[PDB]
Amino acid sequence: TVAHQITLLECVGKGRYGEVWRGSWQGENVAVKIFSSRDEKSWFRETELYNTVMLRHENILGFIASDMTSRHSSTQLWLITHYHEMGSLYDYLQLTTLDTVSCLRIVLSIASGLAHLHIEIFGGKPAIAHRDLKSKNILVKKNGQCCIADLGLAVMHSQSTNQLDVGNNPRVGTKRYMAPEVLDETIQVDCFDSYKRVDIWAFGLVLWEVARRMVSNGIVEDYKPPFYDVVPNDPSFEDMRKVVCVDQQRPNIPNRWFSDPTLTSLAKLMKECWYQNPSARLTALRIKKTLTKID
Ligand SMILES: CCn1cc(-c2ccnc(Nc3ccc(N4CCN(C5COC5)CC4)cc3)n2)c(-c2cccnc2)n1
């Protein structure tokens, strides 16, 4: 049962991460991620998280089950979750432009999901850093809010024991979105705060991607990924470090943005996610409060 109770209907994505399928469970739409054979530790970590923690939130991909199963005479690792037909924020930002209300809805939902991850709840969940946040890791829901997915690189911290749980995963984050301290390998790995600060850096990149797609003064930019103009597709590790650490570049913020009320708040936020000093960066909770106030 659990995975034998599921019919894989159509495969909506294939990539390094493996495969994502739309499928039926009880005649219900579910997402089914089938992990690539290279990536069993991400499956194990995510199964470990969603099983040992009460991790449920509007803006976090809703867990249904994890399972092992045979197909084509080989073991497959499955993670089954709610299904969101609109797909990834990354693909959404190419299929449409945004007004002010829908841009703010999107980024605030993301900040809310991320704050919920970052914040320990007592008697309950530990603090959780995501460590691979990106537009391709964020699902758009029918109601226009988003939810965060792909918890396989997650790190946890509990105040009761003061134990940092970094797990055992050789996988590293998407290179395009790696904060400088990850690229120049100076991140203080023993301090949980360092990982929250990595999620904030990545959140600023996503915030940048979204803001760009908001119409202001009747105009809008084509979708482009962070640093699209200084690194190739599938950027390499040294590709990113030279741009981020040596040149210390940031995605460009048009000056005009500071004449638009909404874009002004957004551009101020992103700049305070990109401080090269990780301790200078806003926290997720502060981002949520700020966006909650915007109009
Ligand atoms: C690869 C990123 N990931 C997306 C999902 C995920 C979770 C829940 N629901 C959905 N549904 C969905 C619907 C439509 C589309 N499409 C949109 C447009 N289409 C265009 C062709 O060019 C782009 C591409 C595909 C994609 C996904 N996906 C998951 C996942 C799944 C299970 C467990 N853990 C994570 N990982």
Q: Hey, which residues does 8 pair with through a beta bridge? A: 23
Is the Cβ atom of 13 under 6 angstroms away from ligand 1? yes
Nearest to 269 by CA among 58, 54, 104, 51: 104
Say how many domains are in the chain: 2
**Which of 53, 85, 117 represents a domain boundary (last residue)?**
85
**Protein residue closest via CA to atom 5 of ligand 1:** 20
Cα 55 from Cα 130, distance rounded (Å): 13
The amino acid at residue 260 is D
Cα 270 from Cα 273, distance rounded (Å): 5
Closest ligand 1 atom number to CA of residue 15: 1
Is the Cβ atom of 67 under 6 angstroms away from ligand 1? no
CB 132 within 8 A of CB 153: yes
CB 80 within 8 A of CB 25: yes
CATH number for the domain harbouring residue 43: 3.30.200.20
Is the Cβ atom of 91 under 6 angstroms away from ligand 1? yes
Closest ligand 1 atom number to CA of residue 83: 9
Q: What is the resolution of this structure in A?
A: 2.2
CATH number for the domain harbouring residue 233: 1.10.510.10
Q: Exposed, middle or buried: residue 183 (CB in 10 Å: 0-12, 13-18, 19+)?
A: buried
Cα 191 from Cα 163, distance rounded (Å): 10
Is the Cβ atom of 87 under 6 angstroms away from ligand 1? yes
| b/e sequence 109-119, b meaning 16+ C-beta within 10 Å | bbbbbbbbbbe
Does 259 lie in the same domain as 164? yes
Pairing between β-strand 155-158 and β-strand 28-35 as defined by DSSP bridges: unpaired
Q: Which residues are catalytic?
A: 132
The residue whose CB lies within 8 Å of the most ligand 1 atoms, and thus the one to mutate among 12, 49, 136, is: 12
Q: Which structure tokens are listed for 51? A: 């099983």
- Contacts of residues 208-211 at CB distance under 8 Å and 24 or more positions apart, as own/partner, are 208/251, 208/253, 208/270, 209/90, 209/93, 209/135, 210/89, 210/93, 210/98, 210/103, 210/106, 210/107, 210/135, 211/103, 211/107, 211/257, 211/263, 211/266, 211/267, 211/270
Does 33 lie in the same domain as 137? no
Cα of 140 vs centre of ligand 1, distance in Å, is 9
Does 101 lie in the same domain as 80? no
Nearest to 202 by CA among 230, 170, 172, 223: 172
Closest ligand 1 atom number to CA of residue 82: 8
Does 64 lie in the same domain as 147? no
Cα 43 from Cα 258, distance rounded (Å): 43
Does 50 lie in the same domain as 175? no
Containing domain of residue 207, as a range?
Answer: 86-294
| Contacting residues for 25 by C-beta, under 8 A, at least 6 apart | 5, 6, 64, 80
CB 39 within 8 A of CB 171: yes
Cα 100 from Cα 263, distance rounded (Å): 9
